[PDB]
Amino acid sequence: MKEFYLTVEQIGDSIFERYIDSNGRERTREVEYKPSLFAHCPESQATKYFDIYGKPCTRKLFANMRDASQWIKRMEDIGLEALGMDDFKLAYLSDTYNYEIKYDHTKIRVANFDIEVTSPDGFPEPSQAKHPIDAITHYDSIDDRFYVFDLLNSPYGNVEEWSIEIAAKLQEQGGDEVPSEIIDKIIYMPFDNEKELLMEYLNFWQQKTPVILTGWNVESFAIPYVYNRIKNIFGESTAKRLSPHRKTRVKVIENMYGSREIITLFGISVLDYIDLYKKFSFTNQPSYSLDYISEFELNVGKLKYDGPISKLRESNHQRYISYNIIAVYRVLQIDAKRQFINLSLDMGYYAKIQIQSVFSPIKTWDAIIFNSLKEQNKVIPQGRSHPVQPYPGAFVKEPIPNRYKYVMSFDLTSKYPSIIRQVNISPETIAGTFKVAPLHDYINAVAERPSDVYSCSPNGMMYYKDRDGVVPTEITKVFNQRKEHKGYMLAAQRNGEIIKEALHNPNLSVDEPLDVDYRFDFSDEIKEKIKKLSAKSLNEMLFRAQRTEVAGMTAQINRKLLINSLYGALGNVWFRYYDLRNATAITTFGQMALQWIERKVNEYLNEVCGTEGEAFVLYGDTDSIYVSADKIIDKVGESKFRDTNHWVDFLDKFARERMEPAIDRGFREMCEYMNNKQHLMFMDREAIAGPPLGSKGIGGFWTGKKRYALNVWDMEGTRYAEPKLKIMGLETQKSSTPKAVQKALKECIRRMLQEGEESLQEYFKEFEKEFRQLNYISIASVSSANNIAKYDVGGFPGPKCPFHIRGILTYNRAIKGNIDAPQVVEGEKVYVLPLREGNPFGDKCIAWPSGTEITDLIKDDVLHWMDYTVLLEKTFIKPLEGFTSAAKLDYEKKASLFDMF
DNA sequence: TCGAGTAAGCAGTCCGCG
DNA sequence: GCGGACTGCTTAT
Ligand SMILES: Cc1cn([C@H]2C[C@H](O)[C@@H](COP(=O)(O)OP(=O)(O)OP(=O)(O)O)O2)c(=O)[nH]c1=O
Ligand SMILES: [Ca+2]
Ligand SMILES: [Ca+2]
Ligand SMILES: [Ca+2]
Ligand SMILES: [Ca+2]
Ligand SMILES: [Ca+2]
Ligand SMILES: [Ca+2]
Ligand SMILES: [Ca+2]
Ligand SMILES: [Ca+2]
Ligand SMILES: [Ca+2]
């Protein structure tokens, strides 16, 4: 096989590399790598190396990496550019793997671990590591085994061995319900002292050294705790055995308020799953506890136990160990679904970076572009310091707040990357500038043509047209990958809807789910078989279809993120190719594109309707336009349609056969106006929305910018079995809104859009009447909590203290002394509840850590003093009032003359 | 919240507005 | 009571 790296590090003048050799075996080597850098040279000197602007360079080969680093410093002292890849390990990878890397994931050791630490006196701080590590579960992907290290004897209690027999039994048998599919994969090792546990763990680690190391909060807790505990018991040298090269660094992570330490393990790639999840899941969760995320992702029940976790080992060591094992498995289950490890490997090997650098799109793109340029013997520029400066972004149209009955939307494929490609925007393609007119003049095609030679953006920038820039070339490659995966995602989505339709008429029989590839649209034969399957088989297929859709979503949405982040990197001062001229060229072109096509669509529809100055485009934000289709429907007349699906078909056909060609003509003209390199503004129909035929539903509404709701029947060619609410920006979509209130507001919206005013009124009246019965957690607001100390003045709120911070201060006063009280953690999220006048907490609200029950001794008081009236007004009535005023509806029935009878 | 970007919404504080 | 100046937070794209 072709060789591929696992990890790479620079340690002084050596590159240390772990890799898979041509026979599929893991190897390690130390290489005295001699890096090269570059300086500009005269024309007279013959060279094969040129910088991205075509200026000749001479290659400097250094005796070692330290000499090269020192040369860079001396060049700074002289005031001359030192060109080339200054991150020498990336140059090493480029030289050693000068081909498209094909990797075999089955040869990569992926380790997933979790530790337990009993701590009677609060949270066990990893920097101190003052308490025994009393359990480690470490899953190894090559062995496919869970290795469980269990401490039986501790200063906090001696316990009996964990029983795999009890672990496997149902909870109704007094067991722990460790899933049957992993029971045979557990290798259980009890220890009568912590020193032998840790020594054995290190020997195990030496034999099965992780390449990818993951888990939940492993970077912020487990890794520093293990390292520091081992360091405390044995000394530094023993702790450094967690690194295969025996090198570690305490790394200080900081943001704007406060800093924290992590431990860099040289020769390991740590991908903490909480951080993978935050970057790649496109959620914003009220809590990031593993129990909360597991429930959300997997629909598994919370791991229940009596008493605090600090007393679980002594009271129920059996459950303690079983829950440690289950926690490790839950991360594996989340990854089986979301596939973020697969994503990280894919993108890491594509860019030729340390796999952990997938968290940094700047590093990822730096490597991709470097490797691309190096293939042509071109030399990358030196990175430079820039002051942070603002620059303009997207245009957002101010909508007229209203109900909107029939709506069709249109959206550009990968807009900003497509602009980069169309205009040919790159560091080395800048051709000059032209005299800019107001944007309005370009939008209305009255400004003089910018250039008859170069490709232009309405910010004044001109670009070469003779050859693609490196940014366009490389963004296109990742875009094409994205397009492939989006195809699989949408097919799986369409397939899911076929199965949902089939579930209306399930067959009474015993059978199996069909063995099919859900990434491809079901054939006629598969569809006929589906119509004869049982509900059980259909539901199994639906689950599999949905999992395939999720896999496609991960692959496509994060490649979209990567290419959009290349645009973003152009506006980040740490990017080697930072240039606000190019960042602004993209955003300003984007503004024009939106408003240009708004004009073109209005013009087209006014023509086919025989009107003048009528506004068909009701809204647009950044890219998409939303078009009112009322007049189109009315042109034929609602009575002509047999059912909802008939007018959806009609609008689908109208959009595709009439509107899209007009939009295409419109953008082709804009391309010629700007003299762009290639027409790539492909705006296709997105949503078709409206009320069910014959209903009193309103279809949709806008309250303002970034705030709307639509009842959608078809989305990008997926025809839903049941209509789907597309709600953007409204409180239903905000993690700060209480769970039960999201649910209620969503149902109010559903009733508004699908059923009408009377239906809304019936539901509102009931919610208002019954909501005090809702569980306190489900009606609590959520907020991130920053700068708690800044507003703490002797335990009381300082000037301008935020409401949620005031709540935390109230909580802190209430738990003074209470030893079984969780502390609110700076920068994490809290639940927040209002409190009625005269409550014993002495303030108008209280807050506590999100994802948790509030501690027992104040819970009864919070429940007794909760201000349901304020809660309802702020979280439910106020937002609903906004929805209904915008939609011109009443959520309460107003008096009429009929009341007199 | 270490990790690409800007636009813009709403909650809440403080305090003016005769 | 509502709105502007401001901080804080969270969303749309
Ligand atoms: C979602 C998102 C968009 N944008 C910008 C760049 C996008 O091209 C532009 C429009 O956003 P979108 O329409 O959400 O996405 P897209 O056009 O890139 O891809 P597609 O519609 O094919 O799924 O807004 C960002 O800069 N960052 C982001 O995270
Ligand atoms: Ca635990
Ligand atoms: Ca120490
Ligand atoms: Ca788009
Ligand atoms: Ca599309
Ligand atoms: Ca059937
Ligand atoms: Ca969009
Ligand atoms: Ca099209
Ligand atoms: Ca889309
Ligand atoms: Ca009490």
Mutate to test the pocket of ligand 1, among A411, A423, A623 (most ligand atoms within 8 A of CB): A623
Nearest Cα to A450, choosing from A466, A431, A469, A467?
A431
> Per DSSP, what are the bridge partners of residue A848?
A831
Closest nucleotide (C1' vs CA) to A583 is B5
Query: Is A79 within 8 Å of A63 (Cβ atoms)?
Result: no
Angle at A294 between CA A289 and CA A298, to 5 degrees: 165
Does any ligand 1 atom lie closer than 6 A to the CB of residue A395?
A: no
Closest nucleotide (C1' vs CA) to A736 is C10
- Please tell me which residue lies nearest to nucleotide C10, judged from CA to C1': A734
Around Cβ A428, how many Cβ atoms within 10 Å?
Answer: 18
Identify the residue whose C-alpha is closest to ligand 1 atom 3: A564
**Tokens read off for A423:** 């205009």
Listed in sequence order, the residues at least 6 apart from A550 whose beta carbon sits closer than 8 Å to its beta carbon are A337, A338, A339
d(C-alpha A775, C-alpha A559), whole Å: 40
Q: Give me ligand 8 centre to Cα A416, in Å.
A: 18
Identify the residue whose C-alpha is closest to ligand 1 atom 17: A414
d(C-alpha A27, C-alpha A18), whole Å: 6
d(C-alpha A766, C-alpha A764), whole Å: 5
- As to burial, measured by CB atoms within 10 angstroms (0-12 exposed, 13-18 middle, 19+ buried), residue A819 is exposed
Query: Is A298 within 8 Å of A333 (Cβ atoms)?
Result: yes
Residue A747 Cα distances to A114, A695, A751, A883, A898, angstroms:
40, 16, 6, 12, 29
d(C-alpha A506, C-alpha A327), whole Å: 37
- Please tell me which residue lies nearest to nucleotide C12, judged from CA to C1': A706
- Contact, A735 CB vs strand C, < 7 Å: yes
Instruction: Report DSSP state, residue A874.
Output: I
Residue A400 Cα distances to A509, A702, A860, A886, angstroms:
54, 8, 47, 9
- Please tell me which residue lies nearest to nucleotide C11, judged from CA to C1': A729
How would DSSP label each residue in A675-686? T-SS----EEEE
| A864 three-state secondary structure | helix
Does any ligand 1 atom lie closer than 6 A to the CB of residue A89?
A: no
d(C-alpha A200, C-alpha A258), whole Å: 36
Q: Give me ligand 4 centre to Cα A414, in Å.
A: 5
Around Cβ A837, how many Cβ atoms within 10 Å?
Answer: 7
Q: Which residues surround ligand 4, an ion (CB under 5 A)?
A: A 411-412, 415, 623
Chain B bases near protein CB atoms (7 A cut-off)? 1-14
**Tokens read off for A684:** 């296709």
Q: Which ligand is nearest to the CA of A326?
A: 2
Closest-lying ligand 1 atom to the alpha carbon of residue A418:
8
- Please tell me which residue lies nearest to nucleotide B14, judged from CA to C1': A800
A110 sits in which H/E element? strand A110-116
What resolution does the deposited structure have, in angstroms? 1.8
Strands A212-214 and A49-51 come out as: unpaired
Query: Is A808 within 8 Å of A786 (Cβ atoms)?
Result: no
Q: Which amino acid is at A639?
A: S
Does any ligand 1 atom lie closer than 6 A to the CB of residue A416?
A: yes
Q: How far is CA A16 from the centre of its chain?
A: 32
d(C-alpha A415, C-alpha A622), whole Å: 9
d(C-alpha A620, C-alpha A706), whole Å: 9
Does any ligand 1 atom lie closer than 6 A to the CB of residue A622?
A: yes
Query: Is A829 within 8 Å of A852 (Cβ atoms)?
Result: no
* Exposure string over A311-332, b if 16+ CB within 10 A, otherwise e: bbbbebbbbbbbbbbbbbbbbb
Q: Which residues surround ligand 10, an ion (CB under 5 A)?
A: A 860-861
Q: Which ligand is nearest to the CA of A624?
A: 7
**Tokens read off for A776:** 């306190």
Query: Is A58 within 8 Å of A38 (Cβ atoms)?
Result: yes
**Tokens read off for A102:** 């094909």
Around Cβ A649, how many Cβ atoms within 10 Å?
Answer: 16
d(C-alpha A520, C-alpha A536), whole Å: 22
d(C-alpha A798, C-alpha A222), whole Å: 36
Closest-lying ligand 1 atom to the alpha carbon of residue A557:
23
Q: How far is CA A445 from the centre of its chain?
A: 39
Around Cβ A665, how many Cβ atoms within 10 Å?
Answer: 12
Query: Is A408 within 8 Å of A616 (Cβ atoms)?
Result: no
Closest nucleotide (C1' vs CA) to A256 is B1
Query: Roughly how many angstroms between the first and final C-alpha of chain A, as a whole number?
Result: 88
- Contact, A317 CB vs strand C, < 7 Å: no
Listed in sequence order, the residues at least 6 apart from A472 whose beta carbon sits closer than 8 Å to its beta carbon are A420, A421, A424, A425, A426, A429
Closest-lying ligand 1 atom to the alpha carbon of residue A568:
26
Does any ligand 1 atom lie closer than 6 A to the CB of residue A412?
A: yes
Q: Give me ligand 4 centre to Cα A816, in Å.
A: 52
Nearest Cα to A415, choosing from A589, A556, A669?
A589
Mutate to test the pocket of ligand 1, among A281, A553, A558, A564 (most ligand atoms within 8 A of CB): A564
Nearest Cα to A597, choosing from A697, A668, A657, A520?
A668
Chain C bases near protein CB atoms (7 A cut-off)? 7-13
Nearest Cα to A347, choosing from A335, A338, A336, A356?
A356
d(C-alpha A344, C-alpha A357), whole Å: 9
Instruction: Report DSSP state, residue A398.
Output: -
Spanning CA of A439 to C1' of C9, the rounded length in angstroms is 33
How would DSSP label each residue in A188-256? EEEESSHHHHHHHHHHHHHHS--SEEE-SSIIIIIHHHHHHHHHHHH-HHHHGGGSTTS-EEEEEEE-S
**Tokens read off for A804:** 């949620």
Query: Is A351 within 8 Å of A368 (Cβ atoms)?
Result: yes
| A826 three-state secondary structure | coil
d(C-alpha A842, C-alpha A813), whole Å: 9
How would DSSP label each residue in A53-107? TS-EEEEEE-SSHHHHHHHHHHHHHHT---BS--SHHHHHHHHHT-S-----GGG
- Contact, A736 CB vs strand C, < 7 Å: yes
* Exposure string over A860-897, b if 16+ CB within 10 A, otherwise e: ebbeebbbbeebbeebbbebbebbbebbebebeeeeee
Q: Give me ligand 10 centre to Cα A205, in Å.
A: 48
Strand C near-CB residues (< 7 Å), A 377-436? 394
Nearest Cα to A807, choosing from A860, A865, A768?
A865
d(C-alpha A46, C-alpha A353), whole Å: 32
Q: Which amino acid is at A598?
A: E
Domains of chain A (ranges; CATH) run: 1-108+340-382 (3.30.342.10), 109-339 (3.30.420.10), 383-468+573-729 (3.90.1600.10), 469-572 (1.10.287.690), 730-774+867-889 (1.20.1280.300), 775-866 (3.40.1820.10)
- Please tell me which residue lies nearest to nucleotide B11, judged from CA to C1': A803
Q: Give me ligand 8 centre to Cα A421, in Å.
A: 18
Q: Which ligand is nearest to the CA of A538?
A: 6
d(C-alpha A300, C-alpha A337), whole Å: 13
Length of chain A: 901
